[PDB]
């Protein structure tokens, strides 16, 4: 019986290691990682899609988390860091509950329903955007642009150049229509992203792709309050369902409720504030009945996220949460480790 | 800085060790404790008063807890076990919150307000007695008599002889009017408590005092749905206070919210049941708007505590929680250890 | 003499180890197992057919168990995991009896007679299916298809198309008449099973044959209550046998009696409930004289097996118990281990 | 949690060691025990009272068992060995069930109900004696007299001298009226028991009192098939009850059912036969439905105990089983050890 738990705990540590490396890059004030080789080259990066693509993974269970994370990229092309962090948080809280005495099978079925209601509420709370002239598209473009307005303006201009129904096509991907060249300017003709030298093209094309996918998802799925505020808004209701669920199976719902707060906690931690008090003081304005406010990362004061302009696409967070729940369930479902024939 | 926390942990572990050796006697299906000497004498007792009286204490933090608990006993003559267990839980999760990074003063000042609202709501939940012929006095005598009916009837029979307005006299302690003699019968004259042999006189005398004090308090303060149900009922509202309180300080209100679960948790655990599943399944019937429901100690089925016939006095629980809060606040405040002259 | 028993004990622990690896996959809420290579590839599988194919078996006592398990798979293509988890229980209880002082040769014939009367009573308890219009066909198809109704419907829709006497042909195998192709829909023309991608065909083709074999076995041998309830039912009759067998040899009949409870015990354990408490109350529900009372696998309350709708074919369990008896007999007779040229 | 169980295991081993030190003296072919000192003085004896009154006890769990076992002697004056061995078996099986996962409080109440049930069936099964000249009164004195008829005959000769109603009172016991003097012949004047030398007076007086108590009990409450047959008779009924108890509580009832077989197991083991086979062929002979079959101590052939004459009085066995159940419960309750002032 201890060996079965040790099998799960060994897999959990592999997942937590992947989340540990990529959870420091969350939010608008994230931190970058160092990637080194035996030959000695360096790759400074803060975009998690590059971190997961260019990380040495040897433990068998870690590969599944990256597989789902890049499946999300195949879907819409953004939000892999959030999915990895949520999956790590879910698995960590699940193993914490199992160590408390809950059987793993009960935690899995609790986690399933918790993620189900969380997706339901995130879908409900997503507010649609009225036309491409709305400033919320500028807001969601700037945040995907790493707070560089020069790239941000040319993607939103291109979006209004194309149109609404042409953007609604599911067979068309805007990320295939972005190209970056060196020594050029920023304009739309297929858009051209200017770069200084050849080495600057690689990251500029990446951020152009990210902004393209953000504005792509914004029109179809609407708008959700970013910065982890939506996660807290759904976490409160998931806790209500945890009080609603009967039996030992509820403690998976509590695990989903706690795991949903990890994005906001890591955003405030990366912003250079103490998470445990900034999470406490954030609950003051959540008593007012409005569930669209969080914390800004520059002054540490509680402010509503519509006015602050910290916005996230609805499909990115919805799919990130779905993938995180699916992989957390899949990695919790393992009980034994065996060597092949 | 670690030395200031190290001194807190040693104070905590002394308090915890007192509670771990007393908490097993809580509830109707409690278990006894064996006490040994260098001479090897045996003292089998399940009453917390005697175990706390005769137990060796060397760590100064432990002495304060039993001084507070026995002053509580000097007040009304019962409830020391519940107070000690509650103090242990409060101190344990006080240090648990500090381990997470919360400052100690914030936890202290959160414990203060949590205990304040818990006392207020336990006062408001206490239901008064409608005359002394009410069967709930039979119930509160029966639980105080270790579920032995021969002691349960004579204390209520004597009490109805005394009356009411003579019973509310604060200078009158009814537990001083009990005397047990070997080989006698059961009657009032002074309630004469029969016993088989001389050695049996001590435990019967102690049980007579316990039942006498229970019925004494039942008229003064009314009744509360016991078995840990009332502490759960006020724990829910203390959790609402925690969601109402601002800043880092709210983590102490959460500590009070959890510490009120420990009596019911350890009542269920001592019954031979899994406390996790039974605490999970007990929140179902609390959604109906009623807050007077608990769990039985024989079948494991969730039943209403008024009809289940398990009731405890109001002042005993009130003052036990007050003493537990006061001693938790007094013991979390210490930060350093120095030798004297 | 110690060497003879030690040479047996090393054989038992091999059958125990291979049984332990697949015991977690039993039941509708089973847990998957990952199979790592030297090169690091992984196969997540919850079916017991594949885990035995793709695992090292170096201690040759396990080779006999895998050989007889796949030999069992050859007739009716299902229930190999039940066969090996019953074999492990029988062998473990037999060696436990041998530890008490019973010689092995007595336990061998006790096992023989107990398994014989267990086969007799599990055959008798089987209830024939009323045509192909009976919804028990849907019930037995859904369970074999991992509780996925989309694949469950097509197998029984085809089975309607084949007929009664054409399915009753012993030389005709309907598991060869199921084929899976990627990118297609589900229809019967040959049963075509749809799949998303090429990698999804590998598992869909497997579960198609499993579901096909379930409905094939159902017509031949009728229906038996699943979830381990039938093994619990025949266990009591084996216990009644044990009191009738004269001499030291009966204790093998006790080994059969205790081993037949292992399926229900492990299905309950994998479900996330306590096996002892949830198996004790089952026999308390057997007072009515009916032998179908089993346990639901998400609420944990005892429920009559037929009405829950989770039901398993009769011949698969018949031959699984026969194979478990054959291998438990075969392994126990091995007393010495030596080498060749 | 481990310490609470380890505190029980040290208490269990003390009881087991006491029972293990007097288990070989049970039955008509019992084996003596050698006591030693620092001075080297030694006493050879097989009367368990003379061992338990003299062997050294330092673990306080053993002193309670000897206290209640000698209280049984104070009540009647015989059957202390069976009380001790039953207490040991009950405690050993209680801890065996706690090892599996049953909480101690559940086993405790299961044991309580099992012992109450066993007392009820022994009360029913104990048939009365028809007059004083019935040969079973000769037989009970014979077994009480270490299979020597010289002491047995004078006891029944005195018993007819006193009278039936004179024996019926509780205020008078003829265990005190027996007196042994050296150099005297066997006659009654005061039952004068002859002895060879002064040293022979001690054990002869002791066995005279034992035989006196045996025939006291025989008229007082009748007779019960001894040699362990009656405990096997009631153990089947306790096993039948075990299947009716709901939930986790039953495993105490199974412990009571098993612990009642330890008496006959030890009579057979001390006799020089394999207990496991001679229990199987005994329970295989109970097909007729009668509850008087046992095993003879000279040939090992299964015979009815009435014809063999091996008989034991009813009240001694009833009180021994009651004391064994009470002490097993009271030693199972203990879960924590502390040093006192």
Numbering used by the authors:
A (entry chain N), B (entry chain E), C (entry chain O), D (entry chain F): 12 to 200, 356 to 507
Article, verbatim:
Chaperonins are essential protein-folding machines, classified into three structural and phylogenetic groups: Group I (bacterial GroEL), Group II (archaeal thermosome and eukaryotic CCT), and Group III (bacterial thermosome-like). Using ancestral sequence reconstruction (ASR) and protein resurrection, we inferred and experimentally characterized the last common ancestors of these groups (ancestral chaperonins ACI, ACII, and ACIII). We selected several AC nodes for protein synthesis and purification, including the last common ancestors of Group I (ACI), Group II (ACII), and Group III (ACIII), along with the ancestor of the Fibrobacteres–Chlorobi–Bacteroidetes (FCB) Group (AFCB).
ACIII assembled as eight-subunit double rings without ATP-Mg²+, and AFCB formed 7-subunit double rings. The 2D classification of particles of the four ACs revealed that whereas ACI and AFCB formed heptameric rings, ACII and ACIII assembled into octameric rings, mirroring their modern counterparts. By contrast, ACIII and AFCB did not require ATP for either assembly or stability. Group III chaperonins, found in some bacteria, resemble Group II but lack the nucleotide-sensing loop present in Groups I and II. The remaining chaperonins E. coli GroEL, ACI and ACIII exhibited similar hydrolysis patterns. AFCB and ACIII showed similar patterns, with a small initial increase in LDH activity before stabilizing at ∼75% activity after 35 min. The evolutionary progression from an exclusively single-ring structure in ACI, to a mix of single and double rings in ACII, and finally to an exclusively double-ring assembly in ACIII, suggests a gradual, step-by-step evolution from single- to double-ring chaperonins.
